[PDB]
Amino acid sequence: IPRIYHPEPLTSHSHIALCEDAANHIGRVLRMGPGQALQLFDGSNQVFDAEITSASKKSVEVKVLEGQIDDRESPLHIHLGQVMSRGEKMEFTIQKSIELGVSLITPLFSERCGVKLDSERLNKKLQQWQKIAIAACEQCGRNRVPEIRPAMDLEAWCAEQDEGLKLNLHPRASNSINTLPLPVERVRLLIGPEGGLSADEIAMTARYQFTDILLGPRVLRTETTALTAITALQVRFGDLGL
């Protein structure tokens, strides 16, 4: 049964019409009719049974049935600060991170991110990433949709007041996952760009009480370095081991 996100708060026995991307996916790509099985959610951590009543071109109209809490969220809070990159790697990172239960995401600027975006082009990028978050939530069964926060400068993100651990990875780190002081329930995870963080930036994260960690003795691919780290955290402090 297909999972659909609904950008407006859902209620038990209403009729509704799907947002445009949902109607396109269901009726225009999937050519489904009534046709009835759909499962819907809206970010409330609830999930609704629903029936395709009617369907058309541009248009798909359904009715929603019984609703219920279905919590696929990890009890660990992981806030990923991912330094932006010009390619198509940010998109894959968002998608996969969400599948691994990442709680919240802030795209970052740093000295070597190589991204130089105008206000509007960055707003557009952020909307697209929010759509990626939504689609990945449909796929992996999450019923909360993590926010893609507005982009931030590196240091400003580092400076944010927030309880919990602040981690960054470094091949010369003074800790590993297993030597981190317990318990761990909130983590801000900083992932830098391919060109890396500069010595000034490193020094600055230290001023902000970041703990840097080793992630094994092998060299990790940039592309996937976030995923690996998130997976480790989820396994050790989150639900991947439960």
Added chain:
Amino acid sequence: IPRIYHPEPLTSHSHIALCEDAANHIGRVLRMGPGQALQLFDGSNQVFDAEITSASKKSVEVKVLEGQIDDRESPLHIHLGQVMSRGEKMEFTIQKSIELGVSLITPLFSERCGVKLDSERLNKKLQQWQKIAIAACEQCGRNRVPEIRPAMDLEAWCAEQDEGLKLNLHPRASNSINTLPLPVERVRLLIGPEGGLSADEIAMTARYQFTDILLGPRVLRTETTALTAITALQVRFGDLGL
């Protein structure tokens, strides 16, 4: 600033060309050039700033700018079932109804509608009415465009499964707007033809659990009877009082 409907989904910073009726209205009737102020929408309940880049004969090409949600929709769902009539009254009814925030419209056949339309002539009529819906939306500032549903037989429309109230007007009705059980969030409103619904048709709407209502002690003109009823509903359960 002129409001334009665009029959294709809109996006923030694209260039586009207006559909034919829009290009005719803007460049051929309004003789506008660049010339830049236009506001555009596409039924998503969003509205876009836009610039007439170029304009020609048959041709008007523009670029779209920032987009934003601008919700002029009533929170009350009113589905008008309006029995068809041969004159030019259906057109005025569609236009004005839309201006008053009617959610959805189904043109109906009944015993005394006096309309006997061939498939193709009825398809054509429905397209024209959909254009009226669009134009009225441009005018009144609505950013959703209500669907003119395919015409239906009276009883088949009555039989449709749909949560909410089902109303019809009768000078010997057993309720008024104010005696209707609360709350009211969805209404199907049946408006009959000038020759009226027959006793068999009345009896049949009762079988379908229609509630008939009085609409004041004066005799209402056929032409406008829909408008009056919609206005009342919008005032009492919708946004005309807010």
